[PDB]
Symmetry: C3
Subunit: 491 residues, 3 copies
């Protein structure tokens, strides 16, 4: 007659890592790293992204004629721009503080284009001749839609003085520009006056622009340049303009009607007619895992990004093909013990069977669950990357930005890989201890009434029927009741 | 007759968390987190802060007339500005590189304001008419004290050419300005000259300023603006000015006498004629704990900031409501034992009583004490936030700043919280180990001169006088000497 | 007759630290921190650095006459500049965007200077009068070599118009300048024309410069100033210049022919005629070690920098001067067991000896080296500091940079020291555990055929010849056979 302490084995090939041993097969594991995406740009909680196709943000806001698709756009969840849009500033030049502007757009979900200065407001200047073959529309010269390129009328450009007062209740993005002509003759020919300026005044803005009449390379057919500027006009402030030439006046402006979470993804992946809680530049994520390795730049309800390829938490025991029990003095585990991690096998008159020890098994489930939860929960406050953009002469700052973001990525990747690695080791040892402690609880009850065989089995010196077995499995084994019989059975 | 091995218990309610278990009641515990402050701004090693009340630094340094409390100030330890001061640039305008000037102030403890250009040096310009309702002093029109607003005299403004040589041994901080007039009639009424400039030369500076005469919004009731500039004049260099108009000239400048470690604190909490070695914006800290959670931006000899609400190290044992002793084969601890952590319980005919094993108990104290100390020391070189400032067109750099400073708080919080969780688990297991080893040291002496009861108790098979039972704790025991009595009682 | 279990001891004095105990002698250890460097600057994998002596980068690129030895420079591995070189900008002024230019050089290994505008190209200007006492060469007034200070000829400065087209297949760095004269008179003596400008145009550049004629301090004997500008001219683009005075025109320009990892290194250390795979500003490093503590800023294949004095890993066991065995119930280790880490000593009528358990020892070695490797491999992706540069008005950003690099440094120093502490403690307890498990393996085989002395040793109850002793060590000990003799000997 005998009773045995043993543990679970099953047909698992799930594998796990520790500091001392790699690729350890365990009975149960939990993967915590999301490795797949759907290869598509999607809606984000049923709000579709503004996809700019081949337009730059600047092309959109100034109203490049190739960007008409975007003349009026519903509220967006995120903005999508290609790496090198082709439609962007058809007439060459620049948008000042372009990247600071894009930084504003990343907290904006909706604009409403309003007309603030109609062509009616310009009766002594020419509002229709301000076009270029650099900005074709329908096989003819055209221009940016949101601004007007004012030209002289009757061989005269009298001085413009116009104010505009923001009587909307929201912030207003206004854009305007200056034209740098190529030479003294071109300047007379467009504007009459040789020497010219633009004055722009706000409560906070005080700007004076003067044309640089100079010789440059042809870009998109033009040696001329147009430099654009912008400002937020707060509710109840006014903007004042003065110019006696080279002025590219605002026609429309953008009222900021909804702020919130957004971003400007750089991506050329297609829209997928689908919805998601979480979007990256390479595809969207449908997952409950705490971590992923898809891309550092995400928006939505997101797993936390790390640079790993595998990240599995051991929950159960080392599987069969520090405390000395598991794969030690108990040689392997039991396929036949299906209903618990640790338990008993008994052999007697009435036969045999496996039975989980439920108390000690619940303890271990409790603890392993709280470990997983503690590990998930501690990694809620990791770093999250944010796209920021830098122009050509901010390379120091761009490099600093990149190192800082990679810096935290490496720290958080290390922290995650190592915590898993260390806690896996502890989890295997925990199991090994739980089993040694179970074997010891039995050893202590029996004492001299049975022989330790040294492989985790107790051979009884008396007869142990089924209710005597259940007595050992629940810690109520009456030692005196069998001691005499046990006495006799020695020698 | 029995000896027992057991462990301390008490009435303590102090709790600690581990990876597998939250809210574990333990006997002893050391909080390491500071959660209170005195609610007041104080002196810092006897040196008082400069409290600008409702003045900005710009207001102080240019000498807004509503800031006359600060016309001459003693040495300071730190500076305290409200979040939004009402008394800034009274006459609307700007102070160029204002954020950089303030960064400089963060390493200055004292200025000596000095006269460098006396009003008597302007024979040929009016020095008395340079006042404005936008700078009221008691309802009357005034102007910034530290600079002077020259106007025409006798419908004339001749060209100014003056120098100042810095013959102090200290660096000097000099401010000057330019006035932007509203239109050409105004320009002629203040200065005579319609077209004007200001030149400024040092060994490094080479500035030309030209007025932007334009229409602007009114602020503080003025449509005009004043743009102020600053340089640091080295201790044998000279500054050279030239102007035929619009010049706001230096009268006073600031000698940089004491450099040191300061900061500019944003706070509205009140002064309290007190003294500390560590100050935050919400109040002062009187602590020797190694961590606090009051505010990120301290100055002084301070603990290290974390985002935790709780941070308690376990020192002692699991309290009674891995190595299988504490709350294993030994039910519970002993309220009765006082002078120790691990010990013994008599039970012979002379009586009973509790004895501590002072060797074991000591090796534990040494270990736990050195753990706490090793932990505190490893956190000496965490991250200390600085309070950098940024303007309205430096939002990307401000976002970078915010993000990395937060990132480091989240890194150090994760580190602090996890180290405590891990070492807490290791601490309780250390106690458990110590108990087990003590029990084994005593089991291997008795051999079969006692019954292993299996609850930590040893029923002898002979008779132990106090003389004898003290021979167990020492380690000194003769097995043969008491063997005789055994086998007779055994059978 | 007896057999004892024990472990290795030796004459090693190597120490290591754990959380609970500092300076523990162990039998083997592993330094992982390189602490020593050769105090010299060296070739990097065969390639000599460019050492500027007391020339600045500005000096070199503009061609200061004191910097003549850098007219034609071979491919370099890194650049070395002193902290304040004395030959920089002999004629006072500035180089615009100097820090951004250095940033660019940090990715360049080789330029090829080429003549792009020969002196024959200025038939109607003076090409030989543009010299100054501030740029002496061999006792004569002179000038920068890579540009030309054009002055009037025959009391005339005809307006200059000139283009240069980058017909090379390589990017071209071009430098030019404007001279700020001190007054109207001087302006006339040099250039006939009182009011002058410079226009520079590329596809992307649009510059207008006007001289600031003003009073300034003398520097190197001169009150005038020269402001230099630079651009990268892409293949197949052209640069266009127009001036009528104060132009410092290009003569030579630099083709960028080799790009890769470089760095501009601030150092005064003498070159040492020698080679290295890793270089720092204070000396070169030849190391196998994974970590070092020499300098943050390093170039080459290097260790990872940490701010620590000691970093030693435990591999062997506690040395003789948690699991209960090592320095527990087995008091000390054994100088005489030399073949391995854990083993047996036996003592029988045929004598005595030591034998190492190869199976225990080998498992132990595997685990410990896998741990050492695991730790080293987790420390691959630490943060690498980078030299970046900032002017006198970028102090916030400088300071954000300092605190960010110092922040990552302190994080990784913490991660390394604490990983070492934590796994040392584990390594020691692992040994402790391997010994215990080996004791208990023997105990189980002998059962009651022997007496546990409680000190690591089994006093047999029968006669254990040499073949019997090899039993116990093999794990083949035959309990049946000796059973009776053993029984008889208990009496
Ligand atoms: C020196 C001077 O003329 N001060 C006058 C100013 C200035 O003319 C404008 O501020 C110029 O922009 O206007 C007013 C005012 O500010 O109350 C009256 C005041 O006497
Ligand atoms: C690798 C393998 O054989 N997997 C099996 C699975 O197919 C089966 O469903 C399960 C029992 O439910 O046992 C496991
Ligand atoms: C150390 C080791 O065993 N390496 C293996 C790898 O080669 C194998 O491909 C993978 C699963 O297949 O598991 C890991
Ligand atoms: C700068 C400016 O003129 N803003 C005006 C403001 O003063 C006025 O209160 C408002 C109401 O119509 O219109 C706007
Ligand atoms: C500059 C101006 O017109 N002043 C007005 C004020 O009289 C009016 O009460 C208010 C209405 O918004 O706006 C401001
Ligand atoms: C001692 C023994 O026979 N085993 C007992 C059983 O009788 C009892 O009913 C059960 C509680 O449900 O616990 C066990
Ligand atoms: C998981 C858990 O038990 N957390 C508890 C919390 O709910 C309770 O309010 C607090 C009071 O001391 O102690 C802790
Ligand atoms: C004008 C100037 O820059 N600083 C001068 C310095 O050159 C001169 O030697 C010194 C003599 O008193 O006075 C100061
Ligand atoms: C500290 C010490 O004694 N060092 C010695 C070394 O000099 C000697 O060569 C070796 C003998 O094998 O043992 C070790
Ligand atoms: C706390 C302590 O024991 N520290 C000592 C230290 O003083 C000694 O100089 C060092 C090198 O031998 O090793 C250890
Ligand atoms: C900016 C410029 O003029 N670039 C020219 C290019 O247009 C021309 O095709 C080539 C060869 O003649 O030289 C280059
Ligand atoms: C006395 C004894 O145990 N010796 C045997 C030996 O004959 C056998 O060859 C060896 C295997 O390596 O192990 C064992
Ligand atoms: O030119 C407008 C003027 O209006 C009135 C006032 O007193 C002056 O300060 C000036 O601003």
């Amino acid at each position: 007659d005998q009773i045995c302490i043993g543990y679970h084995a099953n047909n698992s090939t799930e594998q796990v890592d520790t500091i001392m041993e790699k690729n350890v097969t365990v009975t149960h594991a939990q993967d915590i790293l999301e490795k797949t995406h759907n290869g598509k740009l999607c809606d984000l909680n049923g709000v579709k992204p503004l996809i700019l196709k081949d337009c730059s943000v600047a092309g959109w806001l100034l109203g490049n004629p190739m960007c008409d698709e975007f003349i009026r756009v519903p509220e967006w969840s995120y903005i999508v721009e290609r790496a090198n849009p082709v439609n962007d500033l058809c007439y060459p030049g620049s948008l000042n503080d372009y990247e600071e502007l894009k930084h504003l757009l990343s907290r904006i979900n909706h604009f409403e284009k309003i007309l603030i200065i109609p062509k009616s407001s310009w009766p002594n200047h020419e509002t229709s001749l301000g076009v270029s073959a650099a900005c074709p529309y329908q096989g003819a010269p055209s221009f940016f839609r949101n601004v007007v390129w004012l030209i002289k009328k009757n061989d005269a450009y009298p001085t413009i003085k116009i104010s505009y007062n923001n009587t909307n209740r929201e912030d207003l993005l206004i854009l305007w520009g200056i034209h740098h002509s190529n030479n003294a003759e071109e300047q007379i020919n467009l504007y009459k006056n040789p020497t010219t300026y633009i004055s722009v005044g706000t409560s906070t803005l005080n700007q004076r622009l003067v044309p640089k009449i100079a010789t440059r390379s042809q870009v998109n057919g033009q040696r001329g340049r147009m430099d654009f500027f912008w400002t937020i006009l707060k509710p109840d402030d006014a903007i004042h303009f003065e110019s006696n030439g080279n002025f590219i006046a605002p026609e429309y402006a953008y009222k900021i009607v909804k702020k919130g979470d957004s971003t400007i993804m750089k991506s050329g992946v297609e829209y997928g007619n689908c919805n998601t809680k979480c979007q990256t530049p390479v595809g969207a994520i449908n997952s409950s895992m705490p971590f992923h390795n898809i891309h550092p730049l995400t928006i939505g309800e997101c797993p936390k990004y790390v640079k790993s390829n595998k990240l599995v938490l051991a929950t159960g025991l080392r599987n069969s093909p520090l405390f000395g029990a598991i794969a030690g003095f108990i040689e392997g585990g039991w396929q036949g013990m299906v209903d618990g991690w640790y338990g008993y096998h008994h052999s007697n008159e009435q036969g045999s069977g496996y039975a989980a020890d439920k108390e000690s098994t619940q303890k271990a489930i409790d603890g392993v669950t709280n470990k997983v939860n503690s590990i998930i929960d501690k990694m809620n406050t990791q770093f999250e990357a944010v796209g920021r953009e830098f122009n050509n002469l901010e390379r120091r700052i761009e490099n600093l930005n990149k190192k800082m973001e990679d810096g935290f990525l490496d720290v958080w990747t290390y922290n995650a890989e190592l915590l898993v690695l260390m806690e896996n080791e502890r989890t295997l040892d925990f199991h090994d201890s739980n089993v040694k402690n179970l074997y010891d609880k039995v050893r202590l009850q029996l004492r001299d009434n049975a022989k330790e065989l040294g492989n985790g089995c107790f051979e009884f010196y008396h007869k142990c029927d089924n209710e005597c077995m259940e007595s050992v499995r629940n810690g109520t084994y009456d030692y005196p009741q069998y001691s005499e019989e046990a006495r006799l059975k020695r020698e």
